[PDB]
């Protein structure tokens, strides 16, 4: 649907750096960030600027709430 | 009997999330939960809404009794 290959968890490795993930938040609270990061990297599409994101991800793909949207 | 593709254990990969890690007690109290979840995912049919359950499963497809049904 977005240019990704049909199978890329069997033929493409991944390294995922994170600057500071030992956040006070119990969860990551940066799920969709990694979702779009992986999609951009594997599809070779540039992730836009000036759009800072946050939100959890489920395996089905529903963006749950996050704690402390004021800080975000 | 429950509408699944005839090849689901040979050509369809699967992932399962259970929140708060596992239960540090002995005995996964959501066996039939996993059964019905896997069935619903592979059925390509929308599951219903807020039908709570608990227990375990057997190799032949039976529900085992579980202790501590009280606090649940």
Cβ distance B15 to A59 less than 8 Å, yes or no, reads: yes
Query: Among all residues of B, which ones are annotated catalytic?
Result: 29, 72
Q: Which residues of B14-35 are buried (b: 16+ CB within 10 A; e: fewer)?
A: eeeeeeeeeeeeeebbbbbbeb
Nearest residue to A69 via CA among A37, A39, A29, A20:
A29
Q: Which residues of A22-36 are buried (b: 16+ CB within 10 A; e: fewer)?
A: eeeeeebbbbbbeee
Q: Which residue in this structure is represented by tokens 């996964």?
A: B28
Give A50 to chain B, closest Cα distance, Å: 32
Dihedral of alpha carbons A67, A16, A32, B23, sign: negative
Q: Where are the beta strands (DSSP E) in B1-72?
A: 56-57, 63-64
What is the nearest CA distance from B41 to chain A, expressed in angstroms? 9
Let me know: does B4 contact B39? Beta carbons within 8 Å.
Answer: yes
* CA–CA dist B52, B41 (Å, integer): 17
Alpha carbons B6 and A61: distance in angstroms, whole number: 25
Beta strands in chain A (DSSP E): none
Resolution, expressed in angstroms to one decimal = 3.6
């Amino acid at each position: 649907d977005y240019g990704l290959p049909e199978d890329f968890y069997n033929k493409v490795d991944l390294h995922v750096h994170v600057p500071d993930g030992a956040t006070p938040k119990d969860g990551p609270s940066a799920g969709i960030t990694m979702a779009t990061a992986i999609a951009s990297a594997l599809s070779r599409r540039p992730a836009r600027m000036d759009i800072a994101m946050t939100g959890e991800v489920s395996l089905r793909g529903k963006v749950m709430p996050i704690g402390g949207v004021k800080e975000k």
